[PDB]
Amino acid sequence: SFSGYLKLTDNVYIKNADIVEEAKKVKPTVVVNAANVYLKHGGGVAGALNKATNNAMQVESDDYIATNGPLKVGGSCVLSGHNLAKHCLHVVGPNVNKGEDIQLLKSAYENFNQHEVLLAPLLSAGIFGADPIHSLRVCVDTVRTNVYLAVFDKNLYDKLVSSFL
């Protein structure tokens, strides 16, 4: 199972870890991807998860978009986890660098409540431009299921833990 996580609340845990390396090690039922509406996994967590699947995640995602059209900002879809997890929950948090409504971050985290346990990144953090401290706050106040957060940056991990209310 998950190891080396710091407990933040009854259901939220956090670790300074590369989510691809965590997924390969644990092979969770659900790994969350920090997706965009087009499921174009170019950079950040999405690019790293896709590269770990040898681009199979992108091929599957392009078929999904060809059939269904784009996701909504705040929305999600369940696809295969390939070699990383049983499933990948592609969740679209607002990209504040694209002027998307940060209030949609709570809607994005609500998708996690449809799964008993997830390995996840902080939504809208990193290249999505939101304040990661705010993202962790929204996570703990929204998600009721068991979420294991993998925060790649050590310095951000320390700041998140030391400032956690």
Ligand X SMILES: Cc1c(NS(C)(=O)=O)c(=O)n(-c2ccccc2)n1C
Determine the residue type at 23.
Answer: A
Q: Which is nearer to ligand X, 93 or 121 (CB)?
A: 121
User: Residue numbers of the site for ligand X (CB under 6 A)?
Assistant: 121-122, 125-126, 132, 151-153, 156
CB of 95 to ligand X, least distance (A): 13
CB of 153 to ligand X, least distance (A): 3
CA distances for 147 relative to 21, 54, 91, 96, 121, angstroms: 17, 26, 14, 23, 9
CB of 62 to ligand X, least distance (A): 25
Q: Which is nearer to ligand X, 28 or 121 (CB)?
A: 121
Q: Which is nearer to ligand X, 81 or 121 (CB)?
A: 121
Asked whether 40 and 70 are in contact (CB, 8 A), the reply is: no
CB of 9 to ligand X, least distance (A): 18
**Sheet with 12-16, edge to edge strand ranges:** 6-7, 12-16, 146-151, 117-120, 30-35, 87-92, 76-80
Q: Which is nearer to ligand X, 65 or 156 (CB)?
A: 156
What helix, strand, coil percent values describe the chain, rounded to 5?
Answer: 40, 20, 40
